[PDB]
């Protein structure tokens, strides 16, 4: 039987990203797509949405980054939200990056808003609750203590559900990972971005006087002589929104 997945792309594509891999469709289907698979995409940030009588055909649904709050109230954001809530209650496989994770933690009750300890832009290390993860799940069988993300984001879950399990943290951010049930599954950092685009946003960002050079310049420190755990997130990302366990 054929597997299809939809990916909800809360994000317009920049300019890199258009001209180097030809969209954020293709970040995404590469990062997260296996050969056979149906990947349909859907703008959500342009007002375009899956039929509600389809949402049964797919296997799983990924929910990507934006430049948009999750807590604004945009009528696009309202839809994405009222259909998460439908293929929530459908226990159809989510997988939330970012903006998603945000997301899927209001559409259950979270608080998402602007992080107390401010953004980032950045490599960052993420710290397993490894007393959250079963030995052969989706994580490994050995689950590390650390793994390496990129960070790309102003605001955080600032009240949780209580029906979400974290699964990671950091210093600064409480919330780094979590899951609901077992078929929500949420990322703060983009395991889809590499240096390129990572380096990219900086530029541009600074160029736009939004940052000072110098956190521009400590913002690629972090990736000159090291990169994310892209192998391992591919991994755990795939295992959960295929069921491969
Ligand atoms: N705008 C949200 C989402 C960021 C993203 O998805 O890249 C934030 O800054 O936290």
Same mark, same amino acid.
Not at 111 to 130: H, S
């Given at each position: 039987?054929?597997?299809?997945? $939809?990916?909800?792309? $809360? ?17 995404? !289907? ?5 050969? #056979?698979?149906?990947? =349909? ?6 007002? +375009?949405?899956?039929?509600?009588? =389809? ?9 990507? #980054?934006?430049?948009? =709050? ?29 903006? #998603? ?7 259950? #009750?979270?608080?998402?808003?602007? $992080? ?5 832009? *950045?490599?960052? /290390?993420?710290?397993?609750? *490894? ?9 490994? @069988? ?5 793994? $390496? ?5 102003? /605001? ?17 951010? +409480? ?18 971005? @590499? ?29 000159? @002589?090291?990169?994310? =755990?892209? *192998? ?6 795939? @295992?959960?929104?295929?069921?491969? !366990?």
């Amino acid at each position: 039987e054929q597997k299809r997945y $939809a990916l909800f792309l $809360a994000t317009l594509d920049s300019e890199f990203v258009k001209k180097t891999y030809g969209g954020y469709h293709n970040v995404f !289907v590469t990062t997260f797509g296996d050969e #056979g698979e149906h990947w =349909d995409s859907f703008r959500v940030v342009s007002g +375009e949405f899956p039929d509600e009588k =389809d949402l049964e055909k797919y296997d799983g649904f990924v929910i990507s #980054g934006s430049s948009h =709050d999750a807590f604004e109230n945009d009528d696009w954001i309202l839809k994405l939200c009222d259909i998460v809530k439908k293929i929530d209650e459908m226990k159809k496989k989510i997988l939330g990056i970012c903006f #998603g994770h945000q997301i899927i933690a209001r559409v259950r #009750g979270g608080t998402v808003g602007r $992080a107390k300890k401010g953004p980032e832009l *950045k490599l960052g /290390d993420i710290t397993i609750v *490894k007393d959250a993860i079963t030995p052969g799940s989706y994580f490994g @069988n050995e689950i590390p203590d650390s793994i $390496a993300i990129i960070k790309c984001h102003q /605001d955080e879950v600032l009240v949780l559900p209580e029906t979400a399990k974290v699964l990671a943290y950091s210093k600064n951010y +409480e919330v780094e990972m979590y899951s609901i049930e077992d078929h929500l599954f949420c990322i703060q950092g983009h395991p889809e971005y @590499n240096k390129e685009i990572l380096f990219e946003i900086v530029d541009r960002v600074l160029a736009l006087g939004y940052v000072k050079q110098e956190f521009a310049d400590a913002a690629k420190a972090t990736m000159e @002589n090291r990169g994310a =755990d892209r *192998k391992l997130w591919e991994t755990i990302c795939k @295992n959960f929104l295929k069921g491969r !366990v």
